[PDB]
DNA sequence: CCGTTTAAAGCCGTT
DNA sequence: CCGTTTAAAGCCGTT
DNA sequence: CCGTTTAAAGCCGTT
DNA sequence: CCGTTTAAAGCCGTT
DNA sequence: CCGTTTAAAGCCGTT
DNA sequence: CCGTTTAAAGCCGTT
DNA sequence: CCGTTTAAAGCCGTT
DNA sequence: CCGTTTAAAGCCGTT
């Protein structure tokens, strides 16, 4: 639901890299991310914890 | 370097699945962001481009 | 559905780093990978090509 | 060094949803199934774990 | 297939 | 408890 | 065609 | 917001 | 150009 | 192994 | 910033 | 021990 990415930064380094970024580039990075946190919830539960850390992502 | 995710929305959402952030979650899943934007610009070059598409995650 | 890594070769490899393979870890980095194919196709195709490349992995 | 994967099961099924496999997709599917391994055998250490889980990968 | 044994899980008081 | 792995069992042609 | 970015418009207190 | 312009898409004959 | 796959070549015991 | 053929790459004018 | 408190870590005997 | 979050402190214009 919400956009948990700084769009303008993200733009900036990919800039920096010598590329740009399309209108829908920030959408589907922002679906990534979620992918990455529902993963990592997953994992923090598998080992019995409620505290994500980063090991988990 | 910079940061590129909004770390009170990130934790918003895993406190909304029932779960706590660790002091240096939000770090880690940063590195991973990063990760996965510099595989997407290897993705961008082989297919001959210079705008990466939300495919390219 | 089918099996698409060599079990024996994982936990040959997992070992040699000083670790033990679980008796549903395969079955679960199979999973993993049959993930990795699917998100793969959509990158083939999403460039125009029928042709999957390491690149689209 | 080893393959760990089955190219001819691997370019079954991607025939099987309509696509072809470069004569170097599956080196390059190697390479991230170890990627894939090696972030599993830092989840596990991080848990004081010597077996690897389905849930690490 | 099975025995050996290392490792994970369980319990509880501490950080 | 469970994964690793050594050892036993099975099959068949020889002694 | 589309993404980047420069430039114009908008708002308000000053000249 | 909009103009500039770089880049992607389209078409077709070759590898 | 390259990936797919059909077809030819190789090996050996039979006709 | 090799022939067939589908698909990708190349070139250029348009969006 | 800090106090509250939930959760993770530590220890040891069991599975 | 540590993360969450409530509460206290800081800044400034008013009473």
Do not use: H, Q, W
């Amino acid at each position: 639901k919400d956009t948990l990415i700084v769009a303008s930064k993200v733009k900036a380094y990919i800039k920096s890299k010598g590329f740009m970024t399309s209108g829908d580039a920030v959408d589907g990075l922002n679906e990534k991310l979620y992918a990455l946190i529902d993963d990592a919830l997953k994992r923090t539960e598998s080992n019995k914890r409620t505290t994500v850390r980063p090991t988990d992502f």
